[PDB]
Amino acid sequence: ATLNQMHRLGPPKRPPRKLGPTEGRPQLKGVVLCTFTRKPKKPNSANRKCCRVRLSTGREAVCFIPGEGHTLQEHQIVLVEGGRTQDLPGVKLTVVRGKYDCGHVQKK
Amino acid sequence: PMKGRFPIRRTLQYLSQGNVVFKDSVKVMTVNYNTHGELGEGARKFVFFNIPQIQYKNPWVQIMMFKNMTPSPFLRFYLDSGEQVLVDVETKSNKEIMEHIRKILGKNEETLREEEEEKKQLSHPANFGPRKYCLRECICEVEGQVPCPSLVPLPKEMRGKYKAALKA
Amino acid sequence: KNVLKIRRRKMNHHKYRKLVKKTRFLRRKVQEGRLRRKQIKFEKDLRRIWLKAGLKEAPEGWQTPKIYLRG
Amino acid sequence: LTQGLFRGLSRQETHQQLADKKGLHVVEIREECGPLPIVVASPRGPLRKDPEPEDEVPDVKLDWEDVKTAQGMKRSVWSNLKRAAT
RNA sequence: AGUAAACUGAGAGUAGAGUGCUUAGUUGAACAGGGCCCUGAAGCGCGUACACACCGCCCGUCACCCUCCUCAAGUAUACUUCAAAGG
RNA sequence: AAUAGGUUUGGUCCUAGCCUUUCUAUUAGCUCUUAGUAAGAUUACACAUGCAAGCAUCCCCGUUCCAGUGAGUUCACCCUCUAAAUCACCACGAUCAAAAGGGACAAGCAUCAAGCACGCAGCAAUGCAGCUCAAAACGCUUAGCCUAGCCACACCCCCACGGGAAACAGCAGUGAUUAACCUUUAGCAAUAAACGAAAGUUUAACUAAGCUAUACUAACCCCAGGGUUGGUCAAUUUCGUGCCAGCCACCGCGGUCACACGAUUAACCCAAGUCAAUAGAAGCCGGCGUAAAGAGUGUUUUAGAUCACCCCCUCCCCAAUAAAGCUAAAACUCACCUGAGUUGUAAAAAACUCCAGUUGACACAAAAUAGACUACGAAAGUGGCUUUAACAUAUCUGAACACACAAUAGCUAAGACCCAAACUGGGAUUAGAUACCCCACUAUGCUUAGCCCUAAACCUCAACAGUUAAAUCAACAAAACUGCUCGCCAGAACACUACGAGCCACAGCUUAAAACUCAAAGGACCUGGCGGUGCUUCAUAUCCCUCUAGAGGAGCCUGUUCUGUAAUCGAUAAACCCCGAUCAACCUCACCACCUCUUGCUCAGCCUAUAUACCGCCAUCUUCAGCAAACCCUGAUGAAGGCUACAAAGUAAGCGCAAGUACCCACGUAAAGACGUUAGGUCAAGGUGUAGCCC
Ligand code: FES
Ligand SMILES: [K+]
Ligand SMILES: [K+]
Ligand SMILES: [K+]
Ligand SMILES: [K+]
Ligand SMILES: [K+]
Ligand SMILES: [K+]
Ligand SMILES: [K+]
Ligand SMILES: [K+]
Ligand SMILES: [K+]
Ligand SMILES: [K+]
Ligand SMILES: [K+]
Ligand SMILES: [K+]
Ligand SMILES: [K+]
Ligand SMILES: [K+]
Ligand SMILES: [K+]
Ligand SMILES: [K+]
Ligand SMILES: [Mg+2]
Ligand SMILES: [Mg+2]
Ligand SMILES: [Mg+2]
Ligand SMILES: [Mg+2]
Ligand SMILES: [Mg+2]
Ligand SMILES: [Mg+2]
Ligand SMILES: [Mg+2]
Ligand SMILES: [Mg+2]
Ligand SMILES: [Mg+2]
Ligand SMILES: [Mg+2]
Ligand SMILES: [Mg+2]
Ligand SMILES: [Mg+2]
Ligand SMILES: [Mg+2]
Ligand SMILES: [Mg+2]
Ligand SMILES: [Mg+2]
Ligand SMILES: [Mg+2]
Ligand SMILES: [Mg+2]
Ligand SMILES: [Mg+2]
Ligand SMILES: [Mg+2]
Ligand SMILES: [Mg+2]
Ligand SMILES: [Mg+2]
Ligand SMILES: [Mg+2]
Ligand SMILES: [Mg+2]
Ligand SMILES: [Mg+2]
Ligand SMILES: [Mg+2]
Ligand SMILES: [Mg+2]
Ligand SMILES: [Mg+2]
Ligand SMILES: [Mg+2]
Ligand SMILES: [Mg+2]
Ligand SMILES: [Mg+2]
Ligand SMILES: [Mg+2]
Ligand SMILES: [Mg+2]
Ligand SMILES: [Mg+2]
Ligand SMILES: [Mg+2]
Ligand SMILES: [Mg+2]
Ligand SMILES: [Mg+2]
Ligand SMILES: [Mg+2]
Ligand SMILES: [Mg+2]
Ligand SMILES: [Mg+2]
Ligand SMILES: [Mg+2]
Ligand SMILES: [Mg+2]
Ligand SMILES: [Mg+2]
Ligand SMILES: [Mg+2]
Ligand SMILES: [Mg+2]
Ligand SMILES: [Mg+2]
Ligand SMILES: [Mg+2]
Ligand SMILES: [Mg+2]
């Protein structure tokens, strides 16, 4: 562009940064509604343990439960953080192991 | 690279190299020049090279240009008293034009030196405060004085935690 | 150059024209409803003008025309 | 990158080549040595008598990154970082 | 081309066992020119979205699922505005 | 974004997004010794209790400050003028600083484009009709700010007479709420403020303490944790698991040797912390033939540019445009004569048979040859003839929207109609054929009058001015650049879409997003494969025809598949099928049933699995002639490529072919036949890796 055009348009404007599933917050509190397993997209194969929670913001979302084995049940409290599960399309939240009702993974 | 011919003009270093600082009386400076003609060449280079430097040193003086309104180029200054100063610039180079207006309406090197000195009186070296305004923030920075407790813990005798303990 | 970008646009346009043809009676009822609300929103704007200026009724002899009808 | 680097480094003009091409002294000015003029190259042939023309304003093309850095307008968290001796 | 065709013998392996296999010999032909749809090849080209390489890649309808969005009848709720005025 | 790095492909180059490495803050997990210092609700939600403003011979003064908060939000800055206040009292003053006047002053959205009284003159009466706005008015949304500090607010109704109602956004503290969590301490000794003439008095300001790894500094005989260890990126042993369980920021890992999962061992990094999540820091002088981008055409405005004076060489004519008139060839129709068929083609059917051929008369349709020309017009467009009118501008640039145009298709109305022809009907093809092929006919193509406003409207290359030298240049395409201006672009897809707005448009056009999603998409090349791919030349028992004897039909022999049986295995398109077998009544034998043995013919054994771990021996192209180390050169030193004999960048050991040898020759037949192809065949010739069985 010419100098006249650059002067007329002004400095560039960054697109307003989009908030993720945590709405720009480190963690969110949630209530477990149901548990289930999801199949990852190809070429991965597994039954990844997930759950649907009602976030403290009123929104419902699916969350991945990391680690080997969990004991989450309906009406239990969990803390969810960011970070997508790479091979689970649409799953963008992760339960924090060792907080509220979700305990740490049992050794071996 | 930077756009346009002579991109040096669009640098802060070049703009600060102007030596024309108008007296407080100058309020308006009109420039009448012609786009073509060998005798108006110095006036065109003056508009091309020097007008930015003049405006930079005199931000509150109105500068307005006019093209091909008369047969010859000229400058005209309007002073606060109502006086008008006509300067014929036909045949002169842009450097001779800058030296001319500096002589008749520019502040001399003496008047400018004094103004710079009166500014230095605003930042007294002995004052303490934020780095934006002062050299040192606290007297504890002066060698020989009691240093800041954040770096050198004070003796227990100079601390209220133990003055009140002994007294109480 | 191949025409793969054209082909994507080709199918998009084909499916859109077919969708419009399949629902042209519903869309005609929706369009009619929008033009009515559009006429009402225009009448409110003019009424806001003479009410905020102190008048109690429209200027003498004024009738807001229907500027969105096919006629 | 490699081929371009060797092209640029092989096509550079030394100070002696500059002195011979223009028939003038190449004088170096160092801020650590003050105003002392240091002659780094002199023409082997005859020495010109007419000074090099002093254009009031050079029509050289500038790099915006160099100008933006000299004006303190260059802001980058990755520039001027501390690194191991290279 | 001593080829095909026909005829005859021997051998390997078994205790014995093939209309199979290996091998020697006898009699002993016909046609051999033209062509490139098909199978395939060579040279020189062209095209290519295939590279797991055409048994490729690939497009849309419908069904079945989770995510988001839009339209929308009727109705309800909330919010905004008024005096920045007149007698 | 940097000194950069990883990731698009079979491969290369280009472009490009995403991510990595750095530095902070908050929160979470696990962990945590001391001292000093700094800092310290998520919430303008609701608040129990205590305290936070007095002073003083009464009047007054103060409680309008300080302290708090960030809801709202261009009242903060400069100038002019001028109050209150200080200088005991006047200060024609200074200082400080309101109100008023002038100027300046956040972000995003133009899909907020018009606002609707927003001006001026006059002493007045009243007159004029103006004022703001794409250089962004008006409007919506977001946000305390330009931090020695400033602004704003003080439960709400902008305000606070009044009303709702009964107030911690003062300190400490509590409830609710949030990922977010300090004591219901002391003292007016210092400083500051209020009051007093003053000694002084008061103060949750403040000062000195309490609590907390949030940070900084320092230290400690004993006392270290957290996270990582496939690559980016510093660092893994042994087991378990077996596309399961699980893992990653990106690319990816896991299907029986997992440095990527879990445990364990060791190592690496930082360290009283560690680093999971989140947020921030870090970004316009680059581009627009083919990657996103020159938006169909021209003109001008406000303006911008220096390409305007100087200083100059393509005026007129050829297929611009509008109007009116005209017609040569070919059709249609009609008429006479003649024929009995005409049409359709790879081949048929349907169709017509007032049909066909010759001859004559005969267009509101379309314009051979010229044209191997390259002209005209702004573009769209324009190539039969004649005439009239006629092709802007003595600087350039200048619009999705203003102004005027804009192929084809299409709409409205009235006409013409040879031919063509969506649709439709009939015929045929096909598994089907709503197509491709044949026939018929309509809208439509034409004229007139109005609309509609689109195109691969692309020569995908903006206008004007200039250059051919330098670095000529990623690739391809149509060589590379400079000055100047306008337009436009910023990962892919969503999307020529939704919504808004405008429009003679009502299934339309123009303008044109977002959410959800992915880590690529894309451009140009290289090699290979493939092509119902072109040309040229071929196959010599050979692809087709030609020659001879056969197979395919019958019976029998024999293999295989199926079926059957308690009852092997292997081969199994060419390249399996009288094949491993130059050979099964027992044996062979590896199978089935029953019975028996346990250091066993063997310093055991296994015809158990895996030929997709292999050696060994082979099939196959091969009824081939190629393979290739080591070099050299070309392509800007990219993937890659390397020949022309009147020769132009290739030289090549070795291997194969060849040559030799066997058989009756030098002929023929054998034998030979590389590198590679089919993870081709064989673990059941034998051997053997891995795994498995051992009364
Ligand atoms: S800064 Fe001076 S005593 Fe702390
Ligand atoms: K996998
Ligand atoms: K499908
Ligand atoms: K990259
Ligand atoms: K008092
Ligand atoms: K305050
Ligand atoms: K605020
Ligand atoms: K208020
Ligand atoms: K005190
Ligand atoms: K922590
Ligand atoms: K013609
Ligand atoms: K277009
Ligand atoms: K084109
Ligand atoms: K090819
Ligand atoms: K083998
Ligand atoms: K074997
Ligand atoms: K084996
Ligand atoms: Mg990944
Ligand atoms: Mg092509
Ligand atoms: Mg699509
Ligand atoms: Mg790959
Ligand atoms: Mg807030
Ligand atoms: Mg006063
Ligand atoms: Mg004021
Ligand atoms: Mg605009
Ligand atoms: Mg919209
Ligand atoms: Mg505004
Ligand atoms: Mg706010
Ligand atoms: Mg309150
Ligand atoms: Mg209030
Ligand atoms: Mg409090
Ligand atoms: Mg905190
Ligand atoms: Mg107290
Ligand atoms: Mg404290
Ligand atoms: Mg293992
Ligand atoms: Mg591990
Ligand atoms: Mg493009
Ligand atoms: Mg022709
Ligand atoms: Mg123009
Ligand atoms: Mg525009
Ligand atoms: Mg357009
Ligand atoms: Mg048109
Ligand atoms: Mg028409
Ligand atoms: Mg017809
Ligand atoms: Mg018709
Ligand atoms: Mg006509
Ligand atoms: Mg065209
Ligand atoms: Mg233009
Ligand atoms: Mg995009
Ligand atoms: Mg379109
Ligand atoms: Mg549309
Ligand atoms: Mg719409
Ligand atoms: Mg038979
Ligand atoms: Mg068998
Ligand atoms: Mg088998
Ligand atoms: Mg097998
Ligand atoms: Mg037996
Ligand atoms: Mg037997
Ligand atoms: Mg056995
Ligand atoms: Mg094999
Ligand atoms: Mg021989
Ligand atoms: Mg042989
Ligand atoms: Mg040989
Ligand atoms: Mg195999």
Side-chain angles (χ1 to χ4, degrees):
Chain A
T2 69
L3 294 174
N4 287 9
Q5 288 173 329
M6 296 173 71
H7 172 63
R8 182 163 181 266
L9 300 182
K13 301 166 181 151
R14 297 175 300 177
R17 296 200 184 91
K18 301 166 57 172
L19 293 181
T22 62
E23 297 177 350
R25 299 165 68 177
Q27 302 88 13
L28 293 180
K29 205 168 184 173
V31 178
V32 176
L33 305 180
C34 60
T35 53
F36 50 88
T37 59
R38 288 285 184 85
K39 289 297 212 179
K41 62 179 183 181
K42 55 171 176 292
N44 288 357
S45 302
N47 300 287
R48 310 223 178 278
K49 282 60 172 178
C50 297
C51 66
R52 180 173 286 95
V53 305
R54 187 195 301 104
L55 300 170
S56 59
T57 72
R59 187 177 72 89
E60 291 177 0
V62 179
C63 303
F64 172 70
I65 306 166
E68 294 175 351
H70 70 82
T71 70
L72 288 177
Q73 306 177 14
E74 186 182 8
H75 304 294
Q76 288 189 333
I77 308 302
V78 293
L79 188 72
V80 309
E81 61 181 352
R84 67 194 285 266
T85 314
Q86 288 82 341
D87 59 358
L88 295 181
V91 184
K92 300 181 285 295
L93 294 174
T94 296
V95 177
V96 178
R97 302 302 303 260
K99 186 67 171 180
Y100 298 144
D101 294 352
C102 194
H104 291 282
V105 176
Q106 302 301 291
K107 283 179 168 178
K108 207 177 186 182
Chain B
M2 294 180 68
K3 297 167 181 293
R5 303 191 320 280
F6 296 90
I8 189 68
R9 297 174 299 154
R10 299 190 296 106
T11 67
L12 287 177
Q13 181 57 242
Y14 176 91
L15 291 177
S16 67
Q17 288 172 18
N19 56 333
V20 176
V21 181
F22 291 131
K23 299 173 180 177
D24 299 326
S25 58
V26 180
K27 299 294 174 184
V28 182
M29 173 184 176
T30 57
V31 183
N32 286 78
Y33 71 106
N34 295 330
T35 53
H36 293 72
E38 293 178 341
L39 296 179
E41 178 64 6
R44 287 189 294 273
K45 296 188 185 305
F46 175 80
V47 170
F48 186 87
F49 287 106
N50 305 125
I51 285 293
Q53 295 180 321
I54 294 172
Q55 189 69 90
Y56 187 75
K57 294 295 189 187
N58 307 271
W60 313 129
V61 174
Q62 185 197 1
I63 301 180
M64 191 176 276
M65 266 71 69
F66 300 103
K67 285 178 169 182
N68 301 321
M69 292 192 71
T70 63
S72 58
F74 63 92
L75 308 175
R76 180 142 55 181
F77 300 85
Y78 299 83
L79 308 186
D80 192 7
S81 62
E83 180 181 3
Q84 299 177 14
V85 187
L86 183 68
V87 182
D88 182 7
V89 300
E90 189 176 30
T91 309
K92 292 185 172 181
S93 66
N94 62 310
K95 188 193 295 176
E96 298 171 9
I97 295 166
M98 283 288 277
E99 293 172 348
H100 183 94
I101 63 185
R102 187 194 185 187
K103 172 175 176 176
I104 60 170
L105 290 169
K107 293 175 178 176
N108 54 30
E109 298 178 2
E110 294 172 346
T111 302
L112 295 176
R113 285 170 55 267
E114 295 180 354
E115 292 182 358
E116 298 185 29
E117 296 175 1
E118 306 304 340
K119 285 182 165 185
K120 294 170 61 175
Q121 188 172 23
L122 305 182
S123 56
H124 201 302
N127 293 343
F128 294 92
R131 285 284 196 270
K132 169 174 175 179
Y133 307 104
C134 303
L135 301 170
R136 298 159 293 184
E137 300 178 16
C138 189
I139 194 69
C140 66
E141 304 178 20
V142 184
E143 60 185 306
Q145 311 296 117
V146 176
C148 182
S150 68
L151 299 165
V152 182
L154 295 163
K156 282 198 172 184
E157 291 71 11
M158 296 180 65
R159 292 166 53 187
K161 179 174 179 178
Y162 300 107
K163 291 174 181 180
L166 294 170
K167 296 165 187 176
Chain C
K1 55 177 291 193
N2 62 76
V3 300
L4 287 173
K5 296 176 187 171
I6 291 171
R7 281 180 53 79
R8 180 179 295 107
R9 277 172 52 92
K10 184 173 71 67
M11 181 52 61
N12 287 345
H13 190 66
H14 169 70
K15 293 178 68 173
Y16 178 72
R17 298 314 314 168
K18 213 174 186 177
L19 177 64
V20 171
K21 176 178 184 180
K22 179 181 178 181
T23 63
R24 67 184 185 275
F25 291 111
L26 172 61
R27 301 166 71 91
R28 186 170 184 176
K29 182 180 181 179
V30 172
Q31 182 63 12
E32 182 180 7
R34 290 182 187 174
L35 296 177
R36 293 198 308 269
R37 294 190 297 274
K38 204 172 175 191
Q39 177 64 29
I40 290 164
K41 176 170 177 174
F42 175 62
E43 292 172 353
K44 289 182 180 179
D45 186 72
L46 304 191
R47 178 168 175 271
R48 177 186 60 82
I49 293 290
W50 72 62
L51 289 178
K52 186 175 179 180
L55 306 183
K56 310 303 180 186
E57 298 178 353
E60 294 182 354
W62 173 265
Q63 299 181 7
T64 303
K66 305 291 179 176
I67 61 170
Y68 297 118
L69 301 183
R70 195 167 195 177
Chain D
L1 171 51
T2 306
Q3 199 165 1
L5 183 67
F6 276 92
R7 168 171 292 200
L9 291 173
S10 63
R11 297 180 179 182
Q12 57 183 334
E13 178 179 30
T14 69
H15 290 146
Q16 187 61 57
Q17 295 172 10
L18 182 63
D20 298 353
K21 177 169 68 186
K22 293 183 176 298
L24 295 172
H25 291 285
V26 183
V27 182
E28 184 184 47
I29 302 300
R30 297 195 158 192
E31 299 188 18
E32 62 272 20
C33 299
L36 180 66
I38 302 152
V39 182
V40 293
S42 300
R44 300 201 183 90
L47 183 61
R48 265 170 50 189
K49 293 283 182 175
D50 53 317
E52 190 74 19
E54 301 180 15
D55 188 2
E56 303 179 23
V57 189
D59 195 1
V60 303
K61 299 198 178 185
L62 305 173
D63 194 6
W64 174 230
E65 297 177 14
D66 293 334
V67 170
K68 184 169 59 175
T69 301
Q71 291 173 188
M73 294 167 62
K74 175 59 175 177
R75 300 181 174 86
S76 181
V77 302
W78 299 101
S79 299
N80 306 321
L81 289 181
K82 300 182 180 182
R83 299 172 186 256
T86 62

